[PDB]
Design a protein around this ligand. Structure first.
Ligand code: HEM
Ligand code: HEM
Ligand code: HEM
Ligand code: HEM
Lengths: 146, 141, 141, 146
């Protein structure tokens, strides 16, 4: 995770404007609609059969909010992603059995969600900073897998 | 495989793109170059500074080929045949790179089409770019 | 796409596999779980220790579906419809994992079938394993 | 490099028995036949129209030995691949323009070749240790790309 101060500033500056509740619901829901195989983990969530059933499902929204909340918290510790996510890593591996490739798909969907919300403000250099951040978060969430 | 709904979705989103295609082609490339630097190894002969003319020109060619695939959505392997031979026999771009460009095209359309880039459309556009990539890579070996 | 030479190459190597197919299947799974630990996430119900009967049994299954594919080589999509549905609507294994198993199957064949694992045959088997994979993931979305 | 002492010593002892000339020749050879698109960097080498031609091509054989020679040196710096391969990285990026993905491909071909040569001895644990080294080496080789 080699972020330059200029990259870290652009990342933190854009993040200040994000409504995480709403962005979290959109990202988790879009993941489930674009990459339907990821629904394997959420069969207790109910009807996930159509785009509207996914995007409007209150359990998908509640879970997205929680996912992005842990994510925002990681943005406050960009020099210690591994430590920050150590317990979540273990949980994802030993209890929930989630293949880490899932964290990379979610990162690329987040990037598109952010582009969708901010338009022009999501410049190629800004995107580049966020690509390194989502790669870093994904690797940290996978580091305790065994 | 593209479904009737996917096809309808891609035509709709691409039509809103219209005469901005070329410009979005270029922006997608600049995004790819900055976010995934390994992709520059394939354009050692281009100037890749912001606003480069070579990048603009190539953006247009990429977008025009995508416009061609949308117009021949039910016959893509044939409509893109020549492009597929080119990539397989001359360019020989490693296939992971197509995923990276496709991602940057999605980010570019999201950034410019806030009202049409719904979840259902994002899904269909993503499936379309994967199919185009598959065609272009089908003759590698 | 598999050429005639490829089919011939695949049929002959798998022919020498003969009755060890099951054992090789289990060995490949075992190499995969050790080399690529993320793959264990799809088998939490399995005892994954060395020599477990679930792995063995599963290795016979995998090996036998590949034998069926070799015999139905010109007709894969139909010979594998059922496994194709199984992986897309129930197991939902992420596509990247198929490359990890294929590589391990290749390492397994090379270690047991020296004389037969010539460069052209290695080439053929790798394209064959890729088509099977393509087939197993073609109905995901 | 996250290598165990029993992993490090499995790697080392197996290597002590490798004929680098042969293995290099075979790896680079097999790479060009199995993954034809890698031939883009070797137009000047000669005829590569057939596997027999590729495997027989002496420039290919010589280049293989040179590549595996460097890899062989790296195996004695397992605690510092990045620094050992730093200049090689720069040159592969800046002068040669080789997509780092090719490094992963050679790595996996290389592993199949070791199994082909060592049969029984190239056991699942020993392979797992070589996957780790081979990923490590590709990553070090990719590190200075910009
Ligand atoms: C950005 C990456 C992610 C972060 C930071 C994150 C964070 C979290 C957190 C904080 C929890 C709650 C832990 C608990 O209940 O004790 C959780 C639970 C969970 N996560 Fe992850 N998550 C991420 C990605 C994913 C993805 C990609 C998947 C699967 C596609 C996933 C699947 C799950 C599941 C199934 C649960 C338990 C759901 C339940 O309670 O029913 N997560 N995650
Ligand atoms: C959406 C997928 C892609 C499409 C539709 C596409 C299309 C095209 C087209 C139309 C050309 C023009 C060739 C001519 O003048 O006839 C071209 C050339 C080229 N493409 Fe692709 N391309 C795609 C992805 C890629 C990617 C992933 C790479 C590698 C990063 C790549 C590398 C190149 C290169 C190096 C050239 C030659 C440029 C030059 O020297 O003028 N393309 N492509
Ligand atoms: C060469 C590619 C593969 C082939 C030919 C193949 C074939 C099969 C077959 C025959 C079955 C048994 C279905 C039945 O019992 O009726 C199966 C099940 C299964 N496969 Fe796939 N498979 C492949 C790759 C994978 C991959 C890469 C994974 C994930 C890493 C995977 C995960 C599973 C799982 C978890 C089951 C169910 C296991 C159980 O509950 O017993 N397979 N596959
Ligand atoms: C295991 C990873 C690799 C290592 C350790 C390695 C190492 C080397 C070394 C030591 C040189 C000689 C540099 C010099 O003379 O200054 C070299 C040259 C070269 N390598 Fe790599 N290499 C690797 C993989 C690859 C791959 C996969 C490719 C492309 C398929 C490649 C392409 C080249 C090329 C094109 C040259 C220049 C050859 C010439 O003189 O015409 N390398 N490499």
């Amino acid at each position: 995770m080699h972020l330059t101060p200029e990259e870290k500033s652009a990342v933190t500056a854009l993040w200040g404007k994000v409504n995480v509740d709403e962005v979290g619901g959109e990202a988790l829901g879009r993941l489930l609609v674009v990459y339907p195989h990821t629904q394997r983990f959420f069969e207790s969530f109910g009807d996930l059969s159509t785009p509207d059933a996914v995007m409007g499902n209150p359990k998908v929204k509640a879970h997205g909010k929680k996912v992005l909340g842990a994510f925002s918290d990681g943005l406050a510790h960009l020099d210690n992603l591994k430590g920050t996510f150590a317990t979540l890593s273990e949980l994802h591996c030993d209890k929930l059995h989630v293949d880490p490739e899932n964290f990379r798909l979610l990162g690329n969907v987040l990037v598109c969600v952010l582009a969708h919300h901010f338009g022009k403000e999501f410049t190629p250099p800004v995107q580049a900073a966020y690509q390194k951040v989502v790669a870093g978060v994904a690797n940290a969430l996978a580091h305790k897998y065994h | 495989v593209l479904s009737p709904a996917d096809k309808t979705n891609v035509k709709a989103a691409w039509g809103k793109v219209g005469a901005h295609a070329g410009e979005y082609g270029a922006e997608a490339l600049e995004r790819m170059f900055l976010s995934f630097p390994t992709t520059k190894t394939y354009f050692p002969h281009f100037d890749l500074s912001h606003g480069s003319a070579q990048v603009k020109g190539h953006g247009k060619k990429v977008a025009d080929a995508l416009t061609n695939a949308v117009a021949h959505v039910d016959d893509m392997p044939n409509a893109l045949s020549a492009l597929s031979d080119l990539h397989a026999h001359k360019l020989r771009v490693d296939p992971v790179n197509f995923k990276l460009l496709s991602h940057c095209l999605l980010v570019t359309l999201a950034a410019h089409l806030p009202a049409e880039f719904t979840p259902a459309v994002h899904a269909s556009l993503d499936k379309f770019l994967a199919s185009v990539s598959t065609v272009l890579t089908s003759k590698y070996r």
